[model samples]
Every structure is written in structure tokens, then in C-alpha cells.
Target: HLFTSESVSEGHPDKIADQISDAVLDAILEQDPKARVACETYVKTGMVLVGGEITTSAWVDIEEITRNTVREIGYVHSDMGFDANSCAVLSAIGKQSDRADPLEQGAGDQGLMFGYATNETDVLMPAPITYAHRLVQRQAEVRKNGTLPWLRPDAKSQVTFQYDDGKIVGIDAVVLSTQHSEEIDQKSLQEAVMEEIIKPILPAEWLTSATKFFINPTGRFVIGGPMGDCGLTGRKIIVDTYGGMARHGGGAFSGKDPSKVDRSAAYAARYVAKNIVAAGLADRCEIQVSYAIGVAEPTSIMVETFGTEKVPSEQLTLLVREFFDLRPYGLIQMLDLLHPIYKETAAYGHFGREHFPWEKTDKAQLLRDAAGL
Candidate 1:
């Protein structure tokens, strides 16, 4: 089996929009944790427009936040196709929109969410997406740290893994396309990327002599970022999650606060699935939770372990209900989601990262003990 997954850098046009939207949300959260924010952003040649329904007591400079986010993503100058300082920032933010004991608060909206985990990787995440994220993450690291001074902001990576009987046998292909200054020639660009970016990130054992690499296959990427394409928030939903390795409920995570189950419930679902795998209840797991607008209780909950459950699937589901809280308010408290920490999640795949609360295996032992393991 050959499975492929892809990732975009923070400088990608859509990701820039995502970062701007989440930056606005974070700024509001810093002042008022209870603030209700549903922000969206758009980016084009020389402008950034932020618009969405936001109800908050905190005051924030949306224009400044947008510009700062763009600047931080390495778009400080026009040579990169988008200039943060020179771009026009427009805001169309509105208010449309919460709760007591706060823990008893209802969901912000109606949506379905899915989360997955696997013991295939150390992080309990699918391998293809995990390495794909690291590829672009390395691109940004090198670009910002001067290891690749000519490297520009916009970049992307894709990895195709060959599997035999559910185990990775080798990497079949790697695709990395990055924007850069015209100073570097095509040959030098390819060599540098293969050596510095690809070689360092992918496991050497997986890179057999048969492995294929395509770096900047488009020849030249001097013109990129917003100038290359228009960008909007929530467009990179697949890249933001499991990279197509698992099911998705079709909800985007950026810009919205925890009250919105689109973001919070998805995070909670990941927490549940990761704990299941970590607890040895399953070798792989995927969970789904649904909600109705203004409802405190989840509409439905499900767990699928791909027949790898050490415990019966039904018992694992029961264990999830016993060990984790899927209610909107319950999840918010379980993950401590009311904070200014969303902007960081805008680019990289949200799952498989250790820093986030949803990535913790803290409940593994408790779940294991309760299951009579």
C-alpha cells in the first residue's frame, strides 16, 4: 500500500489567513477567556481582510494583529510577494453571540468531529502525516534561522510511504516545493533541499535507493504567497488534522473559540483517541462526536478500533465514556482550552504535537487499570 500526506508552511497563503484569524481570537482570549470569537480572514496581493462574528468585552486592534501575524510568517517585504507593512488591513468584524458554572455551558454550534490515533508512531499518530508536517516545519526553521537565507516564506511538502501488511517498508516519494529568491539556481536549490531539509527529517532507513525526490519541481517559485493566490481561513482543514489518514467531520479548527465544538470537540476527540491507544486498549483508534447548537450534551459518541482493541470494542467505548468528558463544557475544562494558545496551531497539523493538552497520555494508566489490564 502506498499512502501519501501533505503539509503547508505557515507562509502559505491560506495558512497566513488562518494565523491572522487565530491571532485575533488569541488577542481576545488574552483579555477575556470567556469571549466568543468566530473569526475569518482573507489575503490577496496587497490586502488582508478580517471578518467574522465576534462577541467579546476585550478590545483588540484587528489590523495590527493581522499585520503582525503576516510579518511574523516572513512576509515582511514585497519581494516575497506579500508585504505585511505595506498591505492594507480591513476589518468587518461583527457580534452575534455563552454560560454559568461555565462548565455547564452549551456548545457554540452544531457540528460533527472525528479524531484518530495509532501506535505506528511514537506519538501514536499515523506516520505519513507526522513526517509530512516535519518537512515543512524544517523549511520554516531553516528559512527563519538563515540556514537557507534565500528561502522565502511559502512552501509545501508531501510524503508517500510504502506499506506492507500495515508496516512502513520504505518511502516511495517526497515532494517539497518552496518559494525562494532568484539568487539560487535550480540545481543548487534541489541539492540544498534534499540535503538540508529532506535528509534531516525523514528516517534514513525509509529512503531506499528506489525513493524518488521532487524538490521545487515547478522550476522556479520566485513569485508566491498572496500574490500567487488568494487565501482564506479554514481552507487547509486536511493539512490541519490527520492528513487524510483518518476520517474528518468536515469542520475547520481555526479562528473559533473553545465554545465552538468545531474546534474544542475535535481536540477532545483527539484526546480520547490518543488515550485509548496509549492505554493499550487498541493499536489504533478513531472516534466521532456530534453536537447540536446550544446543547450541553453531545448528540452522539462512537469509537472504532479497527479490530485491534485489546478490550472489546463495546467495553472500550464504555471506558471512553467513563474516563473522558465529551460534553462541550466538560471538554473545555478537560483540556483547559480557554487561553491564547490557538495561533500556534494554525499551521502545523493540530494532532501529534506534544505541547497541546489533547496530546497528553495522562489518562492512559487510569484507563488501563479500569479496563482490568
Candidate 2:
């Protein structure tokens, strides 16, 4: 069997919008932790639109935040498609619903959320996505440095793994297409990408000579980012999470505060799923939690072990109920997520990162002890 996953760079139009929205949310939260934010951003051509609802005593210059966020993404120059300084930024931000509260707050919206983990990778994330993220991450790194000067900001990467009896044995293929300047010839571009991006990130054993590489398959990618596409917040939900390796609850995390279960519950679910695998309770785990607007507790919580549970699925469920809090308010306190840490998550996969509080495995031993294993 073969499984595949893909990732996009922060310069991707949709990701740029995501970053701007999250940056606004972070700035608001930094000023007022109790603030309610549901900021959305749209980008195309030479304009950026900031809309949605936010209620806070914190005074922020929306135009400054939008321009600064865009400038930080290396889009300051006009020749690169979207110019941070020259772009027209319009704001339509309105007040949020008065119902939003911090401690006893209700859910900001109604939706289902899923969290997944597997023992196939060291980070307890799916291997295809883990490597897929690394590929694009390396692309950004090389572009920021002088190593690949011609390489532009916009890029994408996909990884396919050949699995045998549940173990990934080989890489089936790799697809990477990066925007670049006209100075790079096709041959040198491909060779440089292979040497710098692919070889450094992928495992040597998994990459056989037979492995297929499709770098800049189109041979030219001069036009990219908002110039070539319209970008909207929350469009890259798959890239933000598991890279389509698992189920999603149809809600986007960017531009949302922790009061909204769409973002917080999803993070909470991942924390639960990761700890489940980290505690030796399961080799693979996927959890689902649903909620309703104006309610704190989840409407339903379900767990799937894929037949890899060391304890019975029922016992694992019980352990989760005892150890974790599925309530929207409870999750916020448990994870300490009311800070300005969401901007960085807008581009990269939110899971599998050690710096994020939700990704910590400190509860592994505690869960192991509770499960009697």
C-alpha cells in the first residue's frame, strides 16, 4: 500500500492570508487574553481585505499589523507578485458577539474536530506528512539563506511512502514545485533542488535510485503567490493539520480564538491522541469530539485505535475521560493556550512541533501509569 501527504510554504497565497489573520489574533490576545477574535483575511492581486468579528478593549492598528505580517513573509517587493508596502489593505472588522467569555465562556461555534497520531514516526505523526512538512520547511530555509538565491517564497512538496504490512519501507515518489526567478535554468534548478532540498531532508534508505523525483515538473514557475491565485484564510486546513492523512471536522483554525472549539478542541484532541500512542496504549489512534455553540462540554467524544490498543478500547476511553478535559473552557486552561503563540502555527503543520504546548508528551508516563501498563 502507498500513502501520500503534501505541504505548502508560508508564501502560498492561502497561507499568507492565514498568517495575517493569525497575526491579528495574536496581537489582540497579547493585549487582552479575554478578547474574542474571529479574524479572516483575503488576498489577491494588489489588495488585502481584513474582515470578521473581534471584541476587545485592546486597541491595535489593523493596517500596521496587516502590512507588517505581509512584509515579514518577504513579499515587500513588487516584482515578486504581491508587494507588502504597495498593496492596498482594507479593514472591515466588526465587534464580536457579546456572548464570548473567558472562563465560563460558551463555544464560539458549533463543529466536529478530529485528532490523530501514529507510531510510524518519532513525533507520533504520520510519516508522509512529517516528511512532507520537512521538504517545504527546507525550501523556505534555503530561500531565506543565499543557498538558493533564485528560489522564491511560494513552494509545495508531496511525499508518497510504500508501506508493507503497516510499515513504511520505501519512498514511492516525491513532488516539489517551487517558484523561482528567470535566471535559473531548468537543469541547474533541478540539480540544485535535488542536492539541497530533497537529499538533506529525506532519509537515504527510503530514497532509492528508483524513487521518482518531480521537481518543478512544469519547468517554469515564474508567476506564483497571490499574483497567480486568490488567497483566503483557512483554505489550507489540510496543510495546517495532518496533510489529509486523517479526518477533519470541516472547521478552520486560523483567525479563531481558543474559545472556538474548532481550533482549541482540535488541538486538545491531538494532545489526547498523541499521549495515547506515547503511553503505549495504542500504535495508532484517531479521536473525534463534537460540540454545539453556546455549550462548554463536547456533545460526543469517540476514539479509534485501529486494533492497536494495548488495553481494550473501552479502557482507553475511560482513561481519556479521567485524564483529559474535553470542555472548551477546560481545554484552554489545560493547554495554557490563551497566549500569542498562534501566528507561527498558521504556516507549518500545527502538530508534530516540540515548542507548542499541545505537542508535549509530558503526560505519557502519567497515562501509562493510569492505564496499568
Candidate 3:
């Protein structure tokens, strides 16, 4: 059987919007941790807008932040059609709080959240998506550092993994298409990308003579980013989380603060799932938590082990309930979610990074002991 996953580079328009929104959120959080923020952003060909209901005491320069974020993404040149220093940035921000009542500590709205974990990789994430992200990331690394000056900002990578009996064995194919300057020919682009991005990203053992590659298959991707397509925040939810390897709660995580169940509870659920698998209780785990607006406690909590459980799913569920506090207040404190590090999570898929607080396995031993393992 074949399983495929795809990843987008930081220069993708949607990802650019994501980065900006989260950057604003991180900025506000740094100045005021108690800010009630719901910042959203969108990018078109030439103009950008920051529009969302935000309640914060922390003053921010939204226009400055917007231009600086775009510039950092390598869109400084006018030839790219979206220059940071010359773009029109408009803010439609509105406030909802007097900055005195945010500490009440309850979910502002109701939503269901999904989190998933697996032992298919060292990070307890699925293998197909991990490699797919690396492919695009290598594209960025090579482009930004002058290794390939002709490379532009927007890029995509698709990895098809050959699986035997539900486990990944080898790569069947890799398709990488990246934006570039008009200076490079298709033959040169394909050869350089194959040698620099694709070959270095995937494992040699996983690639064989049978592995097929399609680099810049359409010949050219000169115009990209917002010039080629419109981008909106919260659009790349699957790319922000798992890449079709598990379920999503159908909510986006960018720009919203911890009060939104869509962002905070989802991170909490992933933490729970990762810990369950890390404790040697399951090879794969998925956790679901639901909340109602203005309610501090979750309405429902469900855990599934996908038949790889060392302990019964019923008992594992109990351990999770006992060990993790799924409430909004609890999740924020448990994971230290009030930090200004969300911008780093905006680009790459969030769950696989071990350095992120949610990805930590601190609860694994506690879970193992609690489950009588």
C-alpha cells in the first residue's frame, strides 16, 4: 500500500499569513500575558489586512509587524511582486476588554479538539509527514543561505511512502516544486534540487533505484506567494498539525490565544496522546477533548490506542484523566502556554518538535507508573 503526505514552505502565502498572525500574538503575549486576543490576518496580491477582535492592554504596531514579517520571509524585492517595505497594510482591529477580567480563566467558546501520536518516528509522529516537512525545510535552508540563489520563497514537497503491513518501508516517489528566478533552466533546476533538497532530506536506506523524483515538473514557478495566490490565516490547518495521518478538530490554531479551545485544548490533547505512547502503553494514541463556551471543564474526553496498547484502553483513559487536567486553565499552566514562542510553531507542523513544551515527555514516566506498567 502507498501513503503520501505533503508540506509547504514558509514562503507559501497561507504560511506567511500564519506567521504574521502568530507573530502579533507573540508580541502581545510578551507585553501582556493576560491579553484576550483573537487576531486574524489575510494576504492578497498587494495589500494585507489584520482584522480580528482583540482585547489587550499591550500596545502593538500592527503595520510595522506586518511589513517586518513579510520582509523576513524573503519578499523584500519588488520583482517578487510582494515587497515588505512597500506593501499596503491595513488594520481592522477592535477591542473587547478593559483589561481587568481576563483572569477569570474559562473557555471563551465551545469546540471539539483532536490530538494524535504514533511511534512510527522518533518524535512519536507519523513518518510520511516528518520526511515531507524535511524536504520543504531543506528547500528553504538551501535557498536562504545562498546555496541556491535562484530559489524563491514558495515551494511544496510530496512524499509517497511504500508501506507493507501498515509500516513504512521505503519511499515510492518524491515530488518537489519550488518557486525560482527565470535564470535557471528546468534541467538545471531539477538536477540541483535533486542533489541538494531531495537527496539530503530523505534517508538513503529508504530510497532505492525504484524511487521516482519529480522536481519542478511544470517547468517554472517564477511568480509565487501572494502574487500568485491569495493567502489567509488558519488556512493550512492540516499542514499546521498532522499531514492526513490523523483526525483534525476542524479549527485553526494561529493568532488565537490560549482561551480558544481550538488552539490550547488541541495542544493539550496532543500532549496527552504523546505521553501515552511515550510511556510504552501504546504504539499509537489519539485523544479527543470537547468544551463548551464559558465552561472551564471539558464536556468529554476520549482516548483510543488503535490496538497497540500495552494496557487496556479503558485503563489508559483513566490514567489520562488522572494525570492530565484538560481544562483551559490547567492546560495553559501545564504546558506553559503563555510564552511568546508561537511564531516558531506557525510554519512547520507543530507536534513533532521535541523542544516545544507540549512535545515534552515529562508525563510519560508518571503515566507508566500510574497505569501499573
Best by TM-score: 1
| Consecutive 10-residue window with the lowest summed lDDT within model 3 | 96-105
What does candidate 3's lDDT look like per residue over 186-227, in tens digits?
999999998988888798999999999888887889999999
What are the models' TM-scores?
0.98, 0.97, 0.96
Candidate with the larger TM-score of 1 and 2: 1
RMSD of each: 1.1, 1.6, 2.0
Q: Scored by CA lDDT, what does every candidate get?
A: 0.91, 0.91, 0.88
The stretch of ten residues in a row with the least summed lDDT in candidate 1 is 97-106
Candidate 2 lDDT score at position 120: 92
Query: What local lDDT does model 3 show for residue 179?
Result: 94
lDDT of 1 by residue, 1-373 (tens): 8999999999999999999999999999999999988898989999999999988899999878888898899998877778989999998988894565766777767889998999889999999999999999999999999999999999999999998987889899999999999899999999999989999999999998999999999799999999989999999999999999998899888999987888889999999999989999899899999988778888899898888889888888799889888888799889999899999999878888899999999999999999877
- Quality of model 3 by C-alpha lDDT: 0.88
